[PDB]
Structure 1
Amino acid sequence: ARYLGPKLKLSRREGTDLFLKSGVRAIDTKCKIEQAPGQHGARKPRLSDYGVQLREKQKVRRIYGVLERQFRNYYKEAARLKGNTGENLLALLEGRLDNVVYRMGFGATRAEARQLVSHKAIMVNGRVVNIASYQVSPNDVVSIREKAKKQSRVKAALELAEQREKPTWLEVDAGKMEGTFKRKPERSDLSADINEHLIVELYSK
């Protein structure tokens, strides 16, 4: 499941850009930044020791654009792997194709990039990929299909990635419409949107 409705709603509640709807409205008419959504958006949100956890979990799932079933899946995988679950999950979250495609300018938003990956616009290793959750391997290249190399929405997005610093585990070239996923994602540049203390609290319940 994906967000079909109005996308800029979310960013205003969550205190972040979510990297969607990165356009602008003219002369800041009814610009609706610096407010939370709706008529009661000027009222303060209220917390509990679990409430902070649910609001941080919403945050991370709106960053990387993943379902709760996807995030529960990756967190079981994080715990299958040795070491600590928290850092094991943060390594999982940063490498997935839809995010690497937004980082690599193919989509000017998260929703352009998730539509690109589903709609066979990105092929990886030269082979077509129709799922958001494919793990790009180190030193491999993501590569636009010819029928997506015509998309005006992508051609604007890849220019919006030039003179834009990219997370230091990948590079992209507008002129190729191809980006090298140079190496493994690094927690020392990007981490996920949650509290490592809270994630072990719910088993004590």
Structure 2
Amino acid sequence: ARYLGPKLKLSRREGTDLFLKSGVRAIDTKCKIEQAPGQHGARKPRLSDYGVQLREKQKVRRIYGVLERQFRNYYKEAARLKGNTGENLLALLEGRLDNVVYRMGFGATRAEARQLVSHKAIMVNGRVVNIASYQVSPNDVVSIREKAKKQSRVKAALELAEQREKPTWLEVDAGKMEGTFKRKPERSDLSADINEHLIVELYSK
């Protein structure tokens, strides 16, 4: 299910920083970004329409860590909702539990947040959840149980939370590690760069 491989090769493959190597350290420049995705990365591709659709889809997926059948299930869930499909799809991607744990700063990278959810540490509404694909309902409270609280791995990785944008739609206590979930995020608030329209194009055909 999980990739568990070259998480920094994917950032060179898409060109943009996928935040898979976020970490305690800052922007690395240790892998020759944008100029070497692989062995023949010096070639300039033709880069057609289906090409940019597939690159955008795999970019959003390797940001969010979602497999293809699972993301197709998210698209099928977002297609039957109201409003528009493009905002609803990114809202369902943000509604994952490991993404909420990542936005709280409880862990440096996304796989660390997925491991923190999976190892019976992340607890929402008094009920411990192991599945990282937990659809977070509005008006919930997420925290860490006392037997797994602050064994330093949440601690220094919380300092990275002092360097992030710290978005509006969720609030962290940062004294007892008790987060608080709020209303659904607007499209003009989440990362301002990814394109949902190419994903709609690829899953519409």
The superposition leaves residues 135-164 of structure 1 with CA deviations (integer Å, 9 ceiling, x where unpaired) of 222332110123432433222112221353
Tell me if the contact between 2:23 and 2:108 (Cα under 8 Å) persists in the aligned partners: no
Distance 1:164 1:194, change over 3 A: closer
1:68 CA displacement: 0.9
TM-score of the aligned structures, taking structure 1 as reference length: 0.85
Distance 1:197 1:28, change over 3 A: closer
C-alpha distance in 1, partners of 2:104/2:64? Answer: 14
Tell me if the contact between 1:97 and 1:134 (Cα under 8 Å) persists in the aligned partners: yes
C-alpha distance in 2, partners of 1:150/1:24? Answer: 16
C-alpha distance in 2, partners of 1:26/1:172? Answer: 22
1:43 CA displacement: 2.0
C-alpha distance in 2, partners of 1:195/1:162? Answer: 27
Distance 1:129 1:188, change over 3 A: same
Distance 1:114 1:200, change over 3 A: closer
1:103 CA displacement: 0.5
> Any gaps of 5 or more consecutive residues in structure 2?
none
2:167 is matched with 167
1:93 CA displacement: 1.6
Aligned-residue identity in percent: 100
The superposition leaves residues 105-140 of structure 1 with CA deviations (integer Å, 9 ceiling, x where unpaired) of 001101100111111121011210001111222332
1:192 CA displacement: 8.5
1:75 CA displacement: 0.5
Distance 1:134 1:22, change over 3 A: same
Give the alignment's Cα RMSD to 1 decimal. Answer: 2.9
Q: Secondary structure at the match of 2:179?
A: strand
Q: Secondary structure at the match of 1:173?
A: coil
Distance 1:69 1:158, change over 3 A: same
1:196 CA displacement: 5.3
Tell me if the contact between 1:169 and 1:181 (Cα under 8 Å) persists in the aligned partners: yes
Q: Secondary structure at the match of 2:21?
A: coil
Tell me if the contact between 1:25 and 1:31 (Cα under 8 Å) persists in the aligned partners: no
Which shifted more, 102-111 or 6-15? 6-15
1:36 CA displacement: 2.9
Q: Secondary structure at the match of 2:131?
A: coil
C-alpha distance in 2, partners of 1:24/1:191? Answer: 20
Distance 1:54 1:160, change over 3 A: same
C-alpha distance in 2, partners of 1:156/1:166? Answer: 16
Which shifted more, 133-142 or 97-106? 133-142
Tell me if the contact between 2:23 and 2:109 (Cα under 8 Å) persists in the aligned partners: no
Tell me if the contact between 1:162 and 1:174 (Cα under 8 Å) persists in the aligned partners: no
Which shifted more, 18-27 or 4-13? 18-27
Tell me if the contact between 2:53 and 2:202 (Cα under 8 Å) persists in the aligned partners: no
1:180 CA displacement: 0.9
